[PDB]
Amino acid sequence: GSHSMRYFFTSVSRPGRGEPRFIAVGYVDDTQFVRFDSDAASQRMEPRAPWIEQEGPEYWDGETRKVKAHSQTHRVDLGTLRGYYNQSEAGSHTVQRMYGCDVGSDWRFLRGYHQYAYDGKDYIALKEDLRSWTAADMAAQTTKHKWEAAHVAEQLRAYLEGTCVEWLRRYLENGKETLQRTDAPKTHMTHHAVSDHEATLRCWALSFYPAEITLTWQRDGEDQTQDTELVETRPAGDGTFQKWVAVVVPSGQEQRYTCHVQHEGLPKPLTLRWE
Amino acid sequence: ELAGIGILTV
Amino acid sequence: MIQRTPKIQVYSRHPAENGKSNFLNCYVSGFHPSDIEVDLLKNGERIEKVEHSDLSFSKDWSFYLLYYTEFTPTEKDEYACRVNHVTLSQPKIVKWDRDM
Amino acid sequence: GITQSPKYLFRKEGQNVTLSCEQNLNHDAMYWYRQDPGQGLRLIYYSQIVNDFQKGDIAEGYSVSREKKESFPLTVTSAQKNPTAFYLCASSQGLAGAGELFFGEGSRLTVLEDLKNVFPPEVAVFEPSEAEISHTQKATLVCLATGFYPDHVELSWWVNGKEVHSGVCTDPQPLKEQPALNDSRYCLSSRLRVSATFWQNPRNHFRCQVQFYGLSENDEWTQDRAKPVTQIVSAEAWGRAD
Amino acid sequence: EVEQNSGPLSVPEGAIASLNCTYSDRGSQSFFWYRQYSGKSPELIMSIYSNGDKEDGRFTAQLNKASQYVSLLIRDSQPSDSATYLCAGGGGADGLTFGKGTHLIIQPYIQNPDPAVYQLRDSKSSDKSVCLFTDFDSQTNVSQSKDSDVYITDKCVLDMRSMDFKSNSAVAWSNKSDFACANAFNNSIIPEDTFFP
Ligand code: NA
């Protein structure tokens, strides 16, 4: 159904150790398609996908020099920010920029965003409307009065409402086999003991795309919450993902409890119990 | 693809 | 300056059958700042040819990385994942369990 | 704002010449383009950030610093065969080519092949005919700068001590006399129309002047005339009563 | 790489003046129209980043990234609008790439066109003089010389602020034994009712 394109930039100052670490990546949905790293030998915007490789050295050349200029923005930012908050050159510091677009099942613009953040903290962010800004400190308000006064909002909205979608659609069909799929889960249960009158059932779910998933428990059709455990979704390496949810129960009474599993691969939700 | 507009120093 | 300690998960790609070769994933998430040292282990010992993904973050500004390495699971071999960080005052070791 | 100097200059071979381009807008991006009459502007270098610059289409023979964020000085070196052109600097806010490009004021350049083919202008105001004053209620006063080189000339009219604009048009292109060899002479033109009540008022002064840029205190000379010093050459006239 | 319809495409005072331009790059995200006068420094008048029209006063600019069109049309064209319009775009930290140019040359309002060729002797000495062909309509053109060292200059639009007169005025001279004021322009298409002396 719905889709998105994203970029995630991570710039980290390393004082005394020389130039800052710069790491940019690019995602469609939950499929990483481009990346750049300073410490990698390439010094070029590489592909993480096969379908992006299609495009020859016009795409890459520009996309590289785009991303160099992204780092060179942060190089200075890091300077200005150390200025702003009045930090010493001793301590290392971190900025993170994130921008991208959204579309529904009809492949047409929902929403765009541009988040920014010093030392793991919101600093400024382009609001929902893409016309006004939002600043966390006064430090950020200064930057707001720059980013407002120099009509950044104009140039940025046009990227997110325009370019982004014209390219997200392009990338979607260009690698349709991978991006337009849906891989199902593989939900099974492994019964595991804990105490002489107690049992712990794990409702596994493996080898699925997209990451989106909802696993929960039910004792006799009652939404069981507590005495469970639910790990945050693993990237499998695979490309697909995994996610289990546990439940510690009074023993013997094992097959009262149900595992209700929502996913856009499966026709409509799954309910399982111990065999 | 990446932006070439709307990105500026802080 | 915020500091978030990392969330390790140490697991296999495919469900493990003894002798049939598999991949061993260590998945650190929810951490800050960037600098993180990650080593996979066998017999409490340093695995050489580990591969790893590229750094991204989530909506809370916290990073996540994946460190996988091909291996061939057994009984005798106790596989693991160390992680050191500015948040950890000593590398946190996490042995593999295929139930967890 | 943004500013670059000098608007006019040249240098001989076995020497460099640098052009200053300072801006105080607090702009990250900065670019030097050269526009050859014939072509549009071609890019020489640009400079996204401090301590960084980046190649253009014809940068071979040109050099640049970027130590402070303000200045981005283009050194033209003893290297090119066709320096002769008009050199525009500019800064933009944002990334390179993303935004406005506030331009400077250019800088004309010339290959000064030798000191010996350098002639300053001859100026001569021509007095308006009675035929025109009779047809109209007006008087058209015509200045000729004739026989100069190189093409580095301003030209204003000075009425009693009033640099006036309206009434005037100078001339986009200065005219060459013999169009063939690289060595040549130039000759300019300009008109100053005015009312006969102001013109024929016989104690009313009019002066055309040409601010010719030539050899410096820096240069040598081994001839029996005057070094073309960066000077002014002015001819004039007063009205007649009728 | 950013080809323009290089002209001169010419329009009278008040008629509309459309300029077109197209660009050889799908990663272009910024598009501009700078206006440059003779030997002067360029100045922006229309920046457009998104598709559709975007007007401002007398100038309107339109963008279509599908077909790669950018335009600028000048409704109510003054003579302040004369000289060369530069189309240029970018958006990949590559600098900016200008067009060839298009000389948009506005023909002024010569509402009392009384053509004539006068003569102007020297104030320094006598003789060495010139023949000013002047006060004629916009759609007339002067052309270059019959003789070798006769030095005809091209036309010259000329304003006076308070009176609102706007002449055309071409100047031509020579260092000749007998320079004639009718045969200075025996190499043109001069208007008929031209009041010689
Ligand atoms: Na000139």
Query: Token digits for E187?
Result: 């190499």
Work out the angle at residue A261's Cα, subtended by the Cα atoms of residues A258 and A262, and round it to the nearest 5 degrees: 145
Q: Which domains does chain C have, with CATH numbers?
A: 1-100 (2.60.40.10)
Write the CB contacts of A244 (distance below 8 Å, at least 6 apart in sequence): A202, A203, A204, A205, A215, A230, A231
DSSP state of D27: -
Orientation angle between helical segments A138-149 and A57-85, nearest 10 degrees: 130
Residue A219 CB-half CA count within 13 A = 12
The partner residues of E21 in beta bridges, in order of sequence, read E4, E70
Position of tokens 């382009």?
A126
Tell me if chain A has a CB within 8 Å of the CB of C11.
Answer: yes
Position of tokens 């807008």?
D25
Any idea of the CA torsion for E56, E59, E64, E68, to the nearest 10 degrees? -140
Task: Determine the straight-line distance between the first and last CA of chain D, rounded to whole angstroms.
Answer: 51
Query: Token digits for E58?
Result: 């007398």
CATH fold, domain D1-113, is Immunoglobulin-like (2.60.40)
Number of residues assigned to chain C: 100
The partner residues of E161 in beta bridges, in order of sequence, read none
The region, left, alpha or beta by phi > 0 then psi within -120 to 50, assigned to residue A135 is beta
Amino acid at A264: E
Our CA-based measurement puts residue E110 at a distance from the nearest CA of chain A, in whole angstroms, of 43
Report whether D106 contacts D86 (CB < 8 A). Answer: yes
Report whether D168 contacts D150 (CB < 8 A). Answer: no
Resolution of the solved structure (Å): 3.2
DSSP state of D57: S
φ, ψ for residue D149, nearest 5 deg: -170, 140
Chains touching chain D, criterion 3+ CB pairs below 8 Å: A, B, E
Would you call D132 helix, strand, or coil by DSSP? helix
Separation of alpha carbons A24 and A37, rounded Å? 7
Question: Which of 242-271 (A) contact C at CB < 8 A?
Answer: 242
Report whether D214 contacts D225 (CB < 8 A). Answer: no
CA distances from D176 to D115, D150, D160, D182 (A): 19, 11, 31, 11
Q: Determine, for residues A75 and D49 on separate chains, whether the beta-carbon distance falls below 8 Å.
A: yes
CA neighbor of D175 nearest in space, from D187, D183, D157:
D187
Q: Classify residue A272 as exposed, middle or buried by CB count within 10 Å of its CB (0-12, 13-18, 19+).
A: middle
CA neighbor of E179 nearest in space, from E129, E132, E122, E145:
E129
φ, ψ for residue E28, nearest 5 deg: -75, 125
Q: Classify residue A123 as exposed, middle or buried by CB count within 10 Å of its CB (0-12, 13-18, 19+).
A: buried
d(CA E172, ligand 1 centre) in Å: 18
Tally Cβ neighbours within 10 Å of residue A114: 24
Q: Determine, for residues B1 and A59 on separate chains, whether the beta-carbon distance falls below 8 Å.
A: yes
All residues of chain A having their beta carbon less than 8 Å from the beta carbon of residue D56 are none
Query: Token digits for D12?
Result: 């001989």
Compute chain D's Rg from CA coordinates: 22
Query: Token digits for A96?
Result: 């993170």
Please list the helix, strand and coil fractions of chain B in percent, rounded to the nearest 5, in that order.
0, 0, 100
Query: Token digits for D15?
Result: 């020497």
Q: How far is CA A177 from the centre of its chain?
A: 21
All residues of chain E having their beta carbon less than 8 Å from the beta carbon of residue A66 are 92-93
Would you call D196 helix, strand, or coil by DSSP? helix
Number of residues assigned to chain D: 242
Report whether D22 contacts D3 (CB < 8 A). Answer: yes
CA neighbor of D10 nearest in space, from D228, D223, D185:
D228
CA distances from D213 to D8, D132, D135, D185, D186 (A): 7, 35, 40, 14, 13
Counted across chains B and D, CB pairs separated by less than 8 A come out at 16
Q: Is beta strand E9-12 parallel, antiparallel or unpaired with respect to E102-107?
A: parallel
Orientation angle between helical segments A152-161 and A163-174, nearest 10 degrees: 30
Q: Which domains does chain A have, with CATH numbers?
A: 1-181 (3.30.500.10), 182-270 (2.60.40.10)
Task: Nearest by CB to E50, from A63, A65, A161: name it.
Answer: A161
Provide DSSP, chain A. Answer: --EEEEEEEEEE--SSS-SPEEEEEEEETTEEEEEEESSSS--S-EESSSTTTTS-HHHHHHHHHHHHHHHHHHHHHHHHHHHHHT--SSS--EEEEEEEEEE-TT--EEEEEEEEEETTEEEEEE-TTSSS--BSSHHHHHHHHHHHHTTHHHHHHHHHHTHHHHHHHHHHHHTHHHHT--B-----EEEEEEETTEEEEEE---SBBSS--EEEEEESSSEE-SSEEEPPPEE-SSSSEE--EEEEEESS--TTEEEEEE-SSSSS-EEE---
Chain E residue at shortest CA distance from B5: E91
Would you call E185 helix, strand, or coil by DSSP? helix
The chain A residues in contact with chain E (CB within 8 A) are: 58-59, 62-63, 65-66, 68-69, 154-155, 157-159, 161-163, 166
d(CA D187, ligand 1 centre) in Å: 10
Report whether C26 contacts C81 (CB < 8 A). Answer: yes
Separation of alpha carbons E109 and D216, rounded Å? 46
Separation of alpha carbons A259 and A273, rounded Å? 7
Chains touching chain E, criterion 3+ CB pairs below 8 Å: A, B, D
Our CA-based measurement puts residue D54 at a distance from the nearest CA of chain A, in whole angstroms, of 10
Q: Determine, for residues D98 and B6 on separate chains, whether the beta-carbon distance falls below 8 Å.
A: yes
Separation of alpha carbons D44 and D67, rounded Å? 18
In what helix (H) or strand (E) does residue D12 lie, and over which residues does it extend?
none
Q: Is beta strand D85-92 parallel, antiparallel or unpaired with respect to D102-103?
A: antiparallel
Tell me if chain D has a CB within 8 Å of the CB of B9.
Answer: yes
Cis peptide before D73 (omega within 30 of 0): no
Query: Token digits for D114?
Result: 């030798």
Position of tokens 């991978």?
A178
Would you call E168 helix, strand, or coil by DSSP? strand
Separation of alpha carbons D63 and D19, rounded Å? 10
CA neighbor of D125 nearest in space, from D199, D198, D183:
D199
PDB experimental method: X-ray
Our CA-based measurement puts residue A72 at a distance from the nearest CA of chain D, in whole angstroms, of 7
Q: Determine, for residues B5 and A155 on separate chains, whether the beta-carbon distance falls below 8 Å.
A: yes
Query: In the sheet where A214-219 sits, what is the strand order?
Result: A223-224, A214-219, A257-262, A270-272
> Which among A67, A72, A154 is the top mutation candidate for probing chain D, defined by the most D β-carbons within 10 Å of its own β-carbon?
A72
The chain E residues in contact with chain A (CB within 8 A) are: 25, 27, 29-30, 49-51, 65, 92-94
Compute chain E's Rg from CA coordinates: 22
Amino acid at A258: T
Identify the sign of the CA torsion A184, A186, A187, A192: negative
Q: Determine, for residues A69 and D95 on separate chains, whether the beta-carbon distance falls below 8 Å.
A: yes
Separation of alpha carbons A46 and A66, rounded Å? 13
Separation of alpha carbons E36 and D86, rounded Å? 13
> Which among C7, C36, C55, C56 is the top mutation candidate for probing chain A, defined by the most A β-carbons within 10 Å of its own β-carbon?
C56
Tell me if chain C has a CB within 8 Å of the CB of A211.
Answer: no
Separation of alpha carbons D229 and D144, rounded Å? 20
Position of tokens 């506030």?
D102
Separation of alpha carbons A200 and A247, rounded Å? 5
Report whether C36 contacts C65 (CB < 8 A). Answer: yes
Chains touching chain C, criterion 3+ CB pairs below 8 Å: A
Sequence-distant contacts of A115-122: CB under 8 A, at least 24 apart:
A116/B10, A117/C61, A118/A81, A118/A85, A118/A93, A118/A94, A119/A93, A119/A94, A119/C1, A119/C2, A119/C33, A120/A94, A120/A96, A120/C1, A120/C2, A120/C4, A120/C32, A120/C33, A120/C61, A120/C62, A121/C2, A121/C61, A122/C61
CA neighbor of E188 nearest in space, from E142, E156, E149, E150:
E142
Would you call E99 helix, strand, or coil by DSSP? coil
Report whether C11 contacts A238 (CB < 8 A). Answer: no
Compute chain C's Rg from CA coordinates: 14
Tell me if chain B has a CB within 8 Å of the CB of E27.
Answer: yes
Extents of the domains making up chain D: 1-113, 114-242
Chain E residue at shortest CA distance from A62: E92
Counted across chains B and E, CB pairs separated by less than 8 A come out at 14
All residues of chain B having their beta carbon less than 8 Å from the beta carbon of residue D94 are 5-8
Question: Which of 55-94 (E) contact D at CB < 8 A?
Answer: 86, 89-94
φ, ψ for residue E172, nearest 5 deg: -150, 135
DSSP state of E66: T
Report whether A184 contacts A263 (CB < 8 A). Answer: yes
Cis peptide before D172 (omega within 30 of 0): no
Tell me if chain B has a CB within 8 Å of the CB of E51.
Answer: no
Q: How far is CA D104 from the centre of its chain?
A: 14
Amino acid at E99: G
The partner residues of E64 in beta bridges, in order of sequence, read E69
Extents of the domains making up chain E: 1-108, 109-197
CA distances from D148 to A187, D111, D118 (A): 92, 15, 7
CA distances from A264 to A234, A238, C23 (A): 18, 19, 27
